[PDB]
mmCIF file of all heavy atoms in Angstrom:
data_model
loop_
_atom_site.group_PDB
_atom_site.id
_atom_site.type_symbol
_atom_site.label_atom_id
_atom_site.label_comp_id
_atom_site.label_asym_id
_atom_site.label_seq_id
_atom_site.Cartn_x
_atom_site.Cartn_y
_atom_site.Cartn_z
ATOM 1 N N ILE A 1 12.252 2.828 -2.886
ATOM 2 C CA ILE A 1 12.400 3.241 -4.271
ATOM 3 C C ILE A 1 11.977 4.685 -4.451
ATOM 4 O O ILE A 1 10.845 5.005 -4.062
ATOM 5 C CB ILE A 1 11.530 2.354 -5.190
ATOM 6 C CG1 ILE A 1 11.877 0.880 -5.092
ATOM 7 C CG2 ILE A 1 11.589 2.875 -6.619
ATOM 8 C CD1 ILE A 1 10.926 -0.084 -5.762
ATOM 9 N N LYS A 2 12.828 5.537 -5.023
ATOM 10 C CA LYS A 2 12.407 6.933 -5.225
ATOM 11 C C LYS A 2 11.954 7.178 -6.671
ATOM 12 O O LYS A 2 12.622 6.690 -7.568
ATOM 13 C CB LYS A 2 13.520 7.902 -4.876
ATOM 14 C CG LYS A 2 13.119 9.335 -4.592
ATOM 15 C CD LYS A 2 14.355 10.199 -4.374
ATOM 16 C CE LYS A 2 13.952 11.613 -3.981
ATOM 17 N NZ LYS A 2 15.155 12.490 -3.760
ATOM 18 N N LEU A 3 10.862 7.900 -6.840
ATOM 19 C CA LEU A 3 10.286 8.246 -8.137
ATOM 20 C C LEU A 3 11.103 9.362 -8.770
ATOM 21 O O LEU A 3 11.506 10.256 -8.025
ATOM 22 C CB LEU A 3 8.839 8.711 -8.000
ATOM 23 C CG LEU A 3 7.880 7.634 -7.466
ATOM 24 C CD1 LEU A 3 6.475 8.180 -7.285
ATOM 25 C CD2 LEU A 3 7.880 6.421 -8.388
ATOM 26 N N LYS A 4 11.320 9.293 -10.065
ATOM 27 C CA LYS A 4 12.083 10.332 -10.770
ATOM 28 C C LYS A 4 11.354 11.667 -10.673
ATOM 29 O O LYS A 4 11.949 12.745 -10.627
ATOM 30 C CB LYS A 4 12.302 9.923 -12.219
ATOM 31 C CG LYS A 4 13.429 10.630 -12.945
ATOM 32 C CD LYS A 4 13.916 9.865 -14.165
ATOM 33 C CE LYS A 4 15.435 9.815 -14.266
ATOM 34 N NZ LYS A 4 15.964 8.427 -14.128
ATOM 35 N N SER A 5 10.018 11.604 -10.629
ATOM 36 C CA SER A 5 9.237 12.821 -10.409
ATOM 37 C C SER A 5 8.110 12.547 -9.423
ATOM 38 O O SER A 5 7.608 11.415 -9.367
ATOM 39 C CB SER A 5 8.706 13.368 -11.733
ATOM 40 O OG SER A 5 7.996 12.395 -12.472
ATOM 41 N N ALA A 6 7.722 13.548 -8.640
ATOM 42 C CA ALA A 6 6.679 13.357 -7.641
ATOM 43 C C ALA A 6 5.405 12.863 -8.309
ATOM 44 O O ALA A 6 5.026 13.450 -9.326
ATOM 45 C CB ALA A 6 6.381 14.649 -6.893
ATOM 46 N N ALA A 7 4.743 11.852 -7.778
ATOM 47 C CA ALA A 7 3.417 11.455 -8.213
ATOM 48 C C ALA A 7 2.410 12.570 -7.926
ATOM 49 O O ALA A 7 2.556 13.270 -6.938
ATOM 50 C CB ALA A 7 2.898 10.210 -7.509
ATOM 51 N N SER A 8 1.397 12.686 -8.762
ATOM 52 C CA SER A 8 0.256 13.554 -8.490
ATOM 53 C C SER A 8 -0.748 12.807 -7.623
ATOM 54 O O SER A 8 -1.443 11.908 -8.099
ATOM 55 C CB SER A 8 -0.372 13.999 -9.800
ATOM 56 O OG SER A 8 -1.327 15.019 -9.553
ATOM 57 N N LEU A 9 -0.819 13.163 -6.336
ATOM 58 C CA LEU A 9 -1.698 12.445 -5.425
ATOM 59 C C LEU A 9 -3.148 12.792 -5.687
ATOM 60 O O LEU A 9 -3.513 13.945 -5.872
ATOM 61 C CB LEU A 9 -1.307 12.755 -3.970
ATOM 62 C CG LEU A 9 0.148 12.376 -3.658
ATOM 63 C CD1 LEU A 9 0.553 12.942 -2.307
ATOM 64 C CD2 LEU A 9 0.339 10.861 -3.701
ATOM 65 N N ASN A 10 -4.003 11.784 -5.709
ATOM 66 C CA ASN A 10 -5.429 11.996 -5.939
ATOM 67 C C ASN A 10 -6.165 10.825 -5.304
ATOM 68 O O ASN A 10 -5.490 10.029 -4.643
ATOM 69 C CB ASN A 10 -5.746 12.140 -7.418
ATOM 70 C CG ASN A 10 -5.363 10.933 -8.246
ATOM 71 O OD1 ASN A 10 -5.711 9.808 -7.899
ATOM 72 N ND2 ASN A 10 -4.652 11.181 -9.348
ATOM 73 N N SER A 11 -7.461 10.728 -5.494
ATOM 74 C CA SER A 11 -8.266 9.708 -4.832
ATOM 75 C C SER A 11 -7.888 8.271 -5.203
ATOM 76 O O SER A 11 -8.118 7.355 -4.388
ATOM 77 C CB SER A 11 -9.750 9.964 -5.140
ATOM 78 O OG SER A 11 -10.059 9.588 -6.470
ATOM 79 N N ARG A 12 -7.310 8.085 -6.381
ATOM 80 C CA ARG A 12 -6.912 6.794 -6.919
ATOM 81 C C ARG A 12 -5.418 6.510 -6.802
ATOM 82 O O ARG A 12 -4.914 5.428 -7.129
ATOM 83 C CB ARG A 12 -7.323 6.720 -8.401
ATOM 84 C CG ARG A 12 -8.839 6.700 -8.503
ATOM 85 C CD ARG A 12 -9.312 6.528 -9.933
ATOM 86 N NE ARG A 12 -10.758 6.605 -9.996
ATOM 87 C CZ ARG A 12 -11.721 5.719 -10.124
ATOM 88 N NH1 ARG A 12 -11.555 4.406 -10.247
ATOM 89 N NH2 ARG A 12 -12.982 6.175 -10.141
ATOM 90 N N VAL A 13 -4.698 7.521 -6.340
ATOM 91 C CA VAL A 13 -3.253 7.450 -6.143
ATOM 92 C C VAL A 13 -2.913 8.135 -4.821
ATOM 93 O O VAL A 13 -2.838 9.369 -4.782
ATOM 94 C CB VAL A 13 -2.466 8.101 -7.289
ATOM 95 C CG1 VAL A 13 -0.972 8.030 -7.007
ATOM 96 C CG2 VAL A 13 -2.818 7.428 -8.612
ATOM 97 N N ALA A 14 -2.742 7.326 -3.777
ATOM 98 C CA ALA A 14 -2.747 7.809 -2.409
ATOM 99 C C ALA A 14 -1.702 7.060 -1.588
ATOM 100 O O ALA A 14 -1.401 5.919 -1.922
ATOM 101 C CB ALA A 14 -4.104 7.646 -1.746
ATOM 102 N N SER A 15 -1.197 7.763 -0.583
ATOM 103 C CA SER A 15 -0.138 7.163 0.221
ATOM 104 C C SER A 15 -0.751 6.455 1.426
ATOM 105 O O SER A 15 -1.868 6.794 1.801
ATOM 106 C CB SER A 15 0.879 8.210 0.672
ATOM 107 O OG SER A 15 0.235 9.135 1.526
ATOM 108 N N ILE A 16 -0.005 5.501 1.977
ATOM 109 C CA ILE A 16 -0.409 4.763 3.166
ATOM 110 C C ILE A 16 0.573 5.147 4.280
ATOM 111 O O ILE A 16 1.787 5.205 4.077
ATOM 112 C CB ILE A 16 -0.452 3.242 2.927
ATOM 113 C CG1 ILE A 16 -0.998 2.416 4.108
ATOM 114 C CG2 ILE A 16 0.906 2.714 2.497
ATOM 115 C CD1 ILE A 16 -2.435 2.709 4.463
ATOM 116 N N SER A 17 -0.002 5.422 5.434
ATOM 117 C CA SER A 17 0.640 5.775 6.678
ATOM 118 C C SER A 17 1.540 4.650 7.198
ATOM 119 O O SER A 17 1.142 3.492 7.145
ATOM 120 C CB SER A 17 -0.427 6.091 7.744
ATOM 121 O OG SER A 17 -0.619 7.477 7.917
ATOM 122 N N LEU A 18 2.702 5.041 7.686
ATOM 123 C CA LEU A 18 3.592 4.148 8.402
ATOM 124 C C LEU A 18 3.091 3.989 9.827
ATOM 125 O O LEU A 18 2.481 4.897 10.405
ATOM 126 C CB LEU A 18 5.030 4.658 8.398
ATOM 127 C CG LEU A 18 5.637 4.795 6.994
ATOM 128 C CD1 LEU A 18 7.009 5.444 7.060
ATOM 129 C CD2 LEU A 18 5.713 3.436 6.315
ATOM 130 N N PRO A 19 3.325 2.821 10.413
ATOM 131 C CA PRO A 19 2.874 2.637 11.784
ATOM 132 C C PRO A 19 3.645 3.506 12.778
ATOM 133 O O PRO A 19 4.804 3.861 12.611
ATOM 134 C CB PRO A 19 3.192 1.172 12.092
ATOM 135 C CG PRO A 19 3.550 0.530 10.798
ATOM 136 C CD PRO A 19 3.962 1.619 9.856
ATOM 137 N N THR A 20 2.920 3.778 13.848
ATOM 138 C CA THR A 20 3.437 4.416 15.047
ATOM 139 C C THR A 20 3.922 3.340 16.011
ATOM 140 O O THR A 20 4.835 3.529 16.819
ATOM 141 C CB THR A 20 2.355 5.320 15.662
ATOM 142 O OG1 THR A 20 1.355 4.572 16.351
ATOM 143 C CG2 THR A 20 1.625 6.038 14.523
ATOM 144 N N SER A 21 3.304 2.164 15.926
ATOM 145 C CA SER A 21 3.729 1.013 16.724
ATOM 146 C C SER A 21 3.254 -0.242 15.993
ATOM 147 O O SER A 21 2.492 -0.115 15.028
ATOM 148 C CB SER A 21 3.205 1.099 18.144
ATOM 149 O OG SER A 21 3.506 -0.043 18.934
ATOM 150 N N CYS A 22 3.715 -1.402 16.440
ATOM 151 C CA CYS A 22 3.400 -2.667 15.803
ATOM 152 C C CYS A 22 1.955 -3.091 16.054
ATOM 153 O O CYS A 22 1.281 -2.607 16.953
ATOM 154 C CB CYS A 22 4.346 -3.763 16.313
ATOM 155 S SG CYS A 22 6.098 -3.372 16.090
ATOM 156 N N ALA A 23 1.481 -4.015 15.222
ATOM 157 C CA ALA A 23 0.133 -4.543 15.324
ATOM 158 C C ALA A 23 0.199 -5.811 16.181
ATOM 159 O O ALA A 23 1.286 -6.341 16.251
ATOM 160 C CB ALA A 23 -0.483 -4.902 13.982
ATOM 161 N N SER A 24 -0.931 -6.190 16.735
ATOM 162 C CA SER A 24 -1.023 -7.350 17.610
ATOM 163 C C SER A 24 -1.424 -8.598 16.858
ATOM 164 O O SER A 24 -2.070 -8.525 15.815
ATOM 165 C CB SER A 24 -2.074 -7.070 18.698
ATOM 166 O OG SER A 24 -1.891 -5.811 19.310
ATOM 167 N N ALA A 25 -1.086 -9.772 17.398
ATOM 168 C CA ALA A 25 -1.644 -10.998 16.848
ATOM 169 C C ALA A 25 -3.168 -10.873 16.863
ATOM 170 O O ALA A 25 -3.721 -10.256 17.784
ATOM 171 C CB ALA A 25 -1.208 -12.220 17.636
ATOM 172 N N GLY A 26 -3.798 -11.436 15.844
ATOM 173 C CA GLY A 26 -5.236 -11.437 15.767
ATOM 174 C C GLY A 26 -5.836 -10.196 15.135
ATOM 175 O O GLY A 26 -7.029 -10.201 14.843
ATOM 176 N N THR A 27 -5.030 -9.163 14.929
ATOM 177 C CA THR A 27 -5.543 -7.986 14.206
ATOM 178 C C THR A 27 -5.849 -8.348 12.756
ATOM 179 O O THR A 27 -5.021 -9.069 12.174
ATOM 180 C CB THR A 27 -4.497 -6.859 14.270
ATOM 181 O OG1 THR A 27 -4.265 -6.445 15.627
ATOM 182 C CG2 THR A 27 -5.017 -5.645 13.507
ATOM 183 N N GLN A 28 -6.962 -7.915 12.172
ATOM 184 C CA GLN A 28 -7.294 -8.180 10.775
ATOM 185 C C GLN A 28 -6.622 -7.201 9.809
ATOM 186 O O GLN A 28 -6.615 -5.978 10.010
ATOM 187 C CB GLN A 28 -8.802 -8.106 10.532
ATOM 188 C CG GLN A 28 -9.650 -9.210 11.110
ATOM 189 C CD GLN A 28 -9.340 -10.584 10.567
ATOM 190 O OE1 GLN A 28 -8.791 -10.734 9.476
ATOM 191 N NE2 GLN A 28 -9.679 -11.612 11.346
ATOM 192 N N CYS A 29 -6.055 -7.732 8.723
ATOM 193 C CA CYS A 29 -5.357 -6.897 7.751
ATOM 194 C C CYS A 29 -5.883 -7.123 6.338
ATOM 195 O O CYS A 29 -6.585 -8.101 6.060
ATOM 196 C CB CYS A 29 -3.867 -7.234 7.785
ATOM 197 S SG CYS A 29 -3.085 -7.123 9.406
ATOM 198 N N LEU A 30 -5.504 -6.225 5.437
ATOM 199 C CA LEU A 30 -5.753 -6.353 4.014
ATOM 200 C C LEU A 30 -4.457 -6.516 3.205
ATOM 201 O O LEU A 30 -3.568 -5.668 3.265
ATOM 202 C CB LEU A 30 -6.493 -5.127 3.445
ATOM 203 C CG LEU A 30 -6.911 -5.304 1.977
ATOM 204 C CD1 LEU A 30 -8.071 -6.277 1.855
ATOM 205 C CD2 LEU A 30 -7.281 -3.971 1.349
ATOM 206 N N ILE A 31 -4.400 -7.618 2.470
ATOM 207 C CA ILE A 31 -3.298 -8.004 1.603
ATOM 208 C C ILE A 31 -3.804 -8.002 0.170
ATOM 209 O O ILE A 31 -4.921 -8.442 -0.118
ATOM 210 C CB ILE A 31 -2.744 -9.384 2.006
ATOM 211 C CG1 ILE A 31 -2.532 -9.448 3.513
ATOM 212 C CG2 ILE A 31 -1.494 -9.740 1.216
ATOM 213 C CD1 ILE A 31 -2.073 -10.793 4.015
ATOM 214 N N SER A 32 -2.994 -7.473 -0.736
ATOM 215 C CA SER A 32 -3.498 -7.279 -2.106
ATOM 216 C C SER A 32 -2.379 -7.435 -3.114
ATOM 217 O O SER A 32 -1.188 -7.246 -2.812
ATOM 218 C CB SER A 32 -4.141 -5.894 -2.223
ATOM 219 O OG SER A 32 -3.301 -4.887 -1.693
ATOM 220 N N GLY A 33 -2.733 -7.793 -4.346
ATOM 221 C CA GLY A 33 -1.703 -7.978 -5.360
ATOM 222 C C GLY A 33 -2.219 -8.626 -6.635
ATOM 223 O O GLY A 33 -3.373 -9.048 -6.683
ATOM 224 N N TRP A 34 -1.355 -8.686 -7.633
ATOM 225 C CA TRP A 34 -1.584 -9.204 -8.964
ATOM 226 C C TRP A 34 -0.950 -10.573 -9.181
ATOM 227 O O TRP A 34 -0.722 -11.050 -10.300
ATOM 228 C CB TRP A 34 -1.041 -8.195 -9.993
ATOM 229 C CG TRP A 34 -1.877 -6.976 -10.181
ATOM 230 C CD1 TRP A 34 -3.044 -6.863 -10.886
ATOM 231 C CD2 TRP A 34 -1.596 -5.667 -9.648
ATOM 232 N NE1 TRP A 34 -3.504 -5.580 -10.817
ATOM 233 C CE2 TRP A 34 -2.635 -4.821 -10.067
ATOM 234 C CE3 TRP A 34 -0.559 -5.150 -8.856
ATOM 235 C CZ2 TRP A 34 -2.677 -3.465 -9.722
ATOM 236 C CZ3 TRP A 34 -0.600 -3.810 -8.516
ATOM 237 C CH2 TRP A 34 -1.656 -2.988 -8.957
ATOM 238 N N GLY A 35 -0.650 -11.233 -8.059
ATOM 239 C CA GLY A 35 0.017 -12.506 -8.072
ATOM 240 C C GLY A 35 -0.908 -13.679 -8.365
ATOM 241 O O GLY A 35 -2.115 -13.523 -8.559
ATOM 242 N N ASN A 36 -0.282 -14.861 -8.393
ATOM 243 C CA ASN A 36 -0.978 -16.118 -8.670
ATOM 244 C C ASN A 36 -2.172 -16.287 -7.730
ATOM 245 O O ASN A 36 -2.139 -15.966 -6.538
ATOM 246 C CB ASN A 36 -0.008 -17.276 -8.545
ATOM 247 C CG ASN A 36 -0.434 -18.624 -9.087
ATOM 248 O OD1 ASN A 36 -1.485 -18.814 -9.683
ATOM 249 N ND2 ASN A 36 0.424 -19.620 -8.873
ATOM 250 N N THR A 37 -3.249 -16.810 -8.307
ATOM 251 C CA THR A 37 -4.495 -17.046 -7.596
ATOM 252 C C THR A 37 -4.738 -18.539 -7.364
ATOM 253 O O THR A 37 -5.726 -18.906 -6.743
ATOM 254 C CB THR A 37 -5.714 -16.464 -8.340
ATOM 255 O OG1 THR A 37 -5.862 -17.076 -9.620
ATOM 256 C CG2 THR A 37 -5.488 -14.981 -8.565
ATOM 257 N N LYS A 38 -3.821 -19.372 -7.846
ATOM 258 C CA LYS A 38 -3.988 -20.805 -7.665
ATOM 259 C C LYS A 38 -3.067 -21.350 -6.589
ATOM 260 O O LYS A 38 -1.918 -20.929 -6.467
ATOM 261 C CB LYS A 38 -3.698 -21.515 -8.994
ATOM 262 C CG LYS A 38 -4.845 -21.422 -9.983
ATOM 263 C CD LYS A 38 -4.728 -22.416 -11.123
ATOM 264 C CE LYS A 38 -5.838 -22.247 -12.144
ATOM 265 N NZ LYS A 38 -7.199 -22.382 -11.562
#
């Protein structure tokens, strides 16, 4: 999705790096969202 105007990057609005290679089974990750909690 492209933004109509560039976001102003700051400490609370920051980009996440794309991988250089895949992750392994057993690696710990962080998943986040505003979805259902039940």
